[PDB]
């Protein structure tokens, strides 16, 4: 059992750890690290708007959290320089805050004592990239300390455009991604850097930036100037969908693209990727442990362009790619 | 004045009711029809969730209504058949039940006394189908005697597609439309037709059908076969956004592709499309007269791939396009 | 292992089967009615926008649906008279479609071929009406026979009142309901009986009538014309909270008030009854299965005035004393 | 016309500058103070999630916002120590950053050359406290220089307590609000000092404490100790209601209940109270411009005991509360 930190226990932070409980045999959370006192993070780790309330007890006190008898260290250090995670016997930890997503900000877990950090979201500087199940295999122990598992956006649209490239050719694709409110929005209209993620987020559908398609490339170099697109925040507290339209040489049918997706999307990938021709809304995906569920019902062709639409659980699904990576990176030399 | 009546006294029914109020010289609703009583009809004309409280007052008993003192007729009926338009001298009636799209159906208003009909909504069988701004000069007075006035999406996209295909040449677009839950959805989950609109409409995202993609061919012939699409209806209860991605063989920067609009968004023109660079959100479009506000921050090019988006208040917008057209319609020959 | 049909498979119908397949050794429901297909059925069980995906596989053929392998009989039958319990040797039905409320009704299901039935809601001309945990002890096997469930409401509320009043004496109580919005309510303004249901249910808040305070009465006589009150429906989907507001002679304290209602909620009424210091909000009781969690921290006291707040998820909640009644009715003679 | 000045141009200061232009003919805000800059302020005073887009132009510079051709002075001062008022010959300060509720530090701006402050929340230590329509003709223009408009829960059940207490006697109450969410409310699960506030506000009702209640003695003495409450926030975007269950002495009756509001919300004070017989919802008492809307049909009497309900646009209702206020005081010496 690889023995665990989180630096950030939020949103992310926190579905992490559930998915640590609920899914794997070989990982062991040991200590978190976060601003806020014991009794508020507790009562976020057992209640929760979205997933519901926690299987296990929930104990705190002055300088830990103890969940089912099993006594997790936290700590408040707003400056990762002044932890020590090699006290802990820490050998990973899973840096999401948010605000560590330079990779040589990030390095400094190492300096506290660990052996290898993992980014929940895009990095700068990362040794390197990765959506589990496109360009996992390339992982190198050796050299692969400080690593992304980039945006959930990014772990959605990934698998479904390697597997569209590979048999049709992508030449050029632009994205919609329409994607429930994150907490860095305003409830009320407020300011924000950012005019739209500005307004009142539960009433609106507001227009966004993302990365997420340049991002690809990063995990599949072959898609490079080939992609790019945005978000439609829109009310719902979680689940989201990809929509991609591109164009492709090749002459194709709906029942072409959607024959290609199914024939992938088994054995281990198809655990990352998933293949559906059922009713779905965003209610039914949430909770799902795929990283992309693909709508087959959604393609729509017409001449030589294409729209495949992929949905995504923008919470949970990230995070149990993220534990796939874990997994792996644990699974490995350390 | 021309004289108007209204079957079908719904969301379109009600915001055309408005949009007269606030926005013409020269019509007047004398009557309309629907399924209930004038106590249940008063009170969801007096107090709207989107549109807000009624400027003026409103008074009802067994037959009729009165809104600033003038006397609507009300009636109850089911069938259109049993409907007498000519009582009160009504020239053109808004069909807005969404139960008459067949034209075949909705001539019985002629018949009922009625000289046009306009079906606020995609039709079948129609004599024809208007998104004003786009192809409303082919009205023909004498022939066009029931006609369409197409789905809020195909009001939002033609005036887009018109400009830019002009310009650039679409080869072939695929559109989303994000748009407003709406009546026929379901509160919670329930039976319906369409399994997914079966599901709890303000906690979803629900993708569905639409045909307002290929609708466009009716209004711009040379884009048939070349346009298609589907919605995603969300959790807000008006405002919507059409976003189209297409190719074209021009070669396309996203100023250019923004030239276009702004460059054509103008005149009477300009009054069905918007141009905008403002930071527009769902709510800012809300109670909007254009049938389509383009968003050029959301313009985007790859390739020769392009994405383009534009809102529209799918009740308020659309009802605007369709109160332009009964304009149209009432500016000429009613025989 | 007693076997249970469901007549009417909506919310509460599919909460029903869902808390037999989590909760129960010794039921099997066998049979279902509605008014819909195989296929729209077999969906709706499978997905749910509050429950989340079913566990078990299911499958459909133009008769039954299959869930974990088990055949379930399907019936598309408005009128139960059509129907026939005793072909599938059913004993107890609930009569969940909200259409059978009079037992006069409902007692069909017995000639159609059931022992016994159970409404899922407030009824009129029942042989008895139960808050389980509060007065299930008066069952008797031989003269009750069609039997309702009263309301979520009355479920939440009852076990609180029961608990207060025994310690200090209700003069008299007023409540107000703040309830999750619910089916009857429309989607967007349109026509309904309540000219305030009528309205926008997922923006408003929405008063309408309960009769949850008087049907106390019901469970517990002692409380006759003693309880009124009435309910704002909210927007959220499922978590609801009864307000309490009553006097007392007695002279009492917030210590003292919560000191009872925790000194009760224990055993088997515990299950029944929750006692709460957490710090509560809706999604936090989604899925519990009390009928009643009582928040320590909300209550208030004025002179002889005091307030009192208590949880319930009118789904699950309500459904999981349904069960426990279910359970009691199935634990005794079925003749 | 007497010029006027906002610190804090907020939700509710932006509802008092659009409140000023559609209701006002003697009053004029001439200078804002804010912590962000004139193109963010300039973007929410123009669109709004709630009120709409904005009658009038709005342009803007690097210090300054124009409306209507009409040039508002900007600032951005954290410290209203920082600001001249006397520059700009204003007689009003309304102070509505929330952060100066204590009339010790709301002084400042009479330091910094104003000659009346407002303040548009419960304060401490003000020279008074006011529900125009209840104990307005107390106002004292020699000495009631720094004063508190209330809040908006005490300004919808004051005017209907009086008038209850007034013919009926209330022994004692409790009340409960059903509140429109407010912009201190979390959007995702996230750390509040209140652990309840703290929980995502658009999919949750969620309990929390106001002294709204308490603070009705302020306006009615004869009232002190008899009445508590707390709130339900729940997911409207604006509009609220009272609910208020008291015991009396009398013996009444629904419709004798009634009568008593109905009789009294007439004239100058039926422009703060409301009698409807109307089938109303939230979305009905939205930009209305009473501070209390008191709903006849929802009125329960059971023994001695008594359920009264009343309207409120929490935004709305109370700034026009504070209008009437503002202008009262703009009508006397100064
Ligand atoms: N949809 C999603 O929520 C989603 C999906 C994929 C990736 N991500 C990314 O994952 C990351 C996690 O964000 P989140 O949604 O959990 O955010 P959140 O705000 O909900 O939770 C993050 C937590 O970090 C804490 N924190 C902030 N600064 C800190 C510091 N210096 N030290 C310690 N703790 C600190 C906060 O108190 C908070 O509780 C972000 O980079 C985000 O972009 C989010
Ligand atoms: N976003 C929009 O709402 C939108 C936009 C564009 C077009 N439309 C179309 O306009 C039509 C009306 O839509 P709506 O949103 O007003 O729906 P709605 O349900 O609000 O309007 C229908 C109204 O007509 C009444 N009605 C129903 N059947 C009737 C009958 N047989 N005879 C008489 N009255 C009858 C109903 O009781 C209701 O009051 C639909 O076809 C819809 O697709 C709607
Ligand atoms: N919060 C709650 O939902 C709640 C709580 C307690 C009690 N109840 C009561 O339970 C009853 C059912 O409520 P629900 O929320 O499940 O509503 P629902 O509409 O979800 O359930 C009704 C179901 O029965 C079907 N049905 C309708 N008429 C029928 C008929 N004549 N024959 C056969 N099937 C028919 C409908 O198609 C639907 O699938 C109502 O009386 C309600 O007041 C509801
Ligand atoms: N329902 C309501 O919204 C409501 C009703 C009645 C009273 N109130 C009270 O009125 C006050 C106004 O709150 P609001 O809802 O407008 O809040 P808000 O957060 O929506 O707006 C307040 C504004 O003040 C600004 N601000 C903060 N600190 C500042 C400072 N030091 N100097 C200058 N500007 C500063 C912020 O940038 C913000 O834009 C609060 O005391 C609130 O409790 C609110």
Same mark, same amino acid.
């Given at each position: @059992?690889?023995?665990?930190?989180?630096?950030?226990?939020?949103?992310?932070?926190?579905?992490?750890?559930?998915?640590?409980?609920?899914?794997?045999?070989?990982?062991?959370?040991? $200590?978190?690290?976060?601003?806020?006192?014991?009794?508020?993070?507790?009562?976020?780790?057992?209640?929760?708007?979205?997933?519901?309330?926690?299987?296990?007890?929930?104990?705190?006190?002055?300088?830990?959290?103890?969940?089912?008898?099993?006594? %997790?260290?936290?700590?408040?250090?707003?400056?990762?320089?002044?932890?020590?995670?090699?006290? !802990?016997?820490?050998?990973?930890?899973?840096?999401?805050?948010?605000?560590?997503?330079?990779?040589?900000? #990030?390095?400094?877990?190492?300096? $506290?004592?660990?052996?290898?950090?993992?980014?929940?979201?895009?990095?700068?500087?990362?040794?390197?990239?990765?959506?589990?199940?496109?360009? !996992?295999?390339?992982?190198?122990?050796? &050299?692969?300390?400080?690593?992304?598992?980039?945006?959930?956006?990014?772990?959605?649209?990934?698998?479904? #455009?390697?597997?569209?490239?590979?048999?049709?050719?992508?030449?050029?694709?632009?994205?919609? @991604?329409? !994607?429930?409110?994150?907490?860095?929005?305003?409830?009320?209209?407020?300011?924000?850097?950012?005019?739209?993620?500005?307004?009142?987020? $539960?009433? &609106?559908?507001?227009?966004?930036?993302?990365?997420?398609?340049? #991002?690809?490339?990063?995990?599949?170099?072959?898609? *490079?100037?080939?992609?790019?697109?945005?978000?439609?925040?829109?009310?719902? %507290?979680?689940?989201?969908?990809?929509?991609?339209?591109?164009?492709? *040489?090749?002459?194709?049918?709906?029942?072409?693209?959607? $024959?290609?997706?199914?024939?992938?999307?088994?054995?281990?990938?198809?655990?990352?990727?998933?293949?559906?021709?059922?009713?779905?809304?965003?209610?039914?995906?949430?909770?799902?442990? !795929?990283?992309?569920?693909?709508?087959?019902?959604?393609? *729509?062709?017409?001449?030589?362009?294409? *729209?495949?639409?992929?949905?995504?659980?923008?919470?949970?699904?990230?995070?149990?790619?993220?534990?796939?990576?874990?997994?792996?990176?644990?699974?490995?030399?350390?």
């Amino acid at each position: @059992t690889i023995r665990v930190g989180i630096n950030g226990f939020g949103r992310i932070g926190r579905n992490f750890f559930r998915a640590v409980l609920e899914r794997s045999d070989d990982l062991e959370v040991v $200590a978190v690290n976060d601003l806020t006192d014991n009794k508020t993070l507790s009562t976020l780790l057992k209640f929760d708007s979205i997933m519901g309330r926690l299987g296990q007890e929930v104990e705190y006190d002055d300088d830990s959290i103890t969940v089912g008898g099993k006594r %997790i260290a936290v700590y408040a250090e707003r400056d990762p320089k002044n932890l020590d995670w090699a006290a !802990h016997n820490v050998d990973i930890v899973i840096e999401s805050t948010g605000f560590f997503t330079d990779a040589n900000a #990030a390095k400094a877990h190492i300096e $506290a004592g660990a052996k290898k950090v993992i980014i929940s979201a895009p990095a700068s500087n990362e040794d390197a990239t990765f959506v589990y199940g496109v360009n !996992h295999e390339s992982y190198d122990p050796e &050299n692969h300390n400080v690593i992304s598992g980039a945006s959930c956006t990014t772990n959605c649209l990934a698998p479904m #455009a390697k597997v569209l490239n590979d048999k049709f050719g992508i030449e050029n694709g632009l994205m919609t @991604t329409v !994607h429930a409110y994150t907490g860095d929005q305003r409830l009320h209209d407020a300011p924000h850097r950012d005019l739209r993620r500005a307004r009142a987020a $539960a009433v &609106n559908i507001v227009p966004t930036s993302t990365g997420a398609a340049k #991002a690809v490339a990063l995990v599949l170099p072959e898609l *490079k100037g080939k992609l790019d697109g945005y978000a439609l925040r829109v009310p719902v %507290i979680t689940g989201s969908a990809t929509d991609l339209t591109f164009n492709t *040489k090749s002459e194709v049918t709906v029942e072409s693209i959607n $024959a290609a997706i199914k024939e992938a999307a088994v054995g281990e990938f198809g655990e990352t990727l998933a293949y559906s021709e059922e009713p779905l809304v965003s209610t039914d995906i949430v909770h799902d442990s !795929h990283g992309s569920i693909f709508d087959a019902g959604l393609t *729509k062709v017409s001449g030589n362009t294409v *729209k495949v639409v992929s949905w995504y659980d923008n919470e949970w699904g990230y995070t149990c790619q993220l534990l796939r990576l874990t997994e792996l990176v644990a699974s490995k030399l350390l």
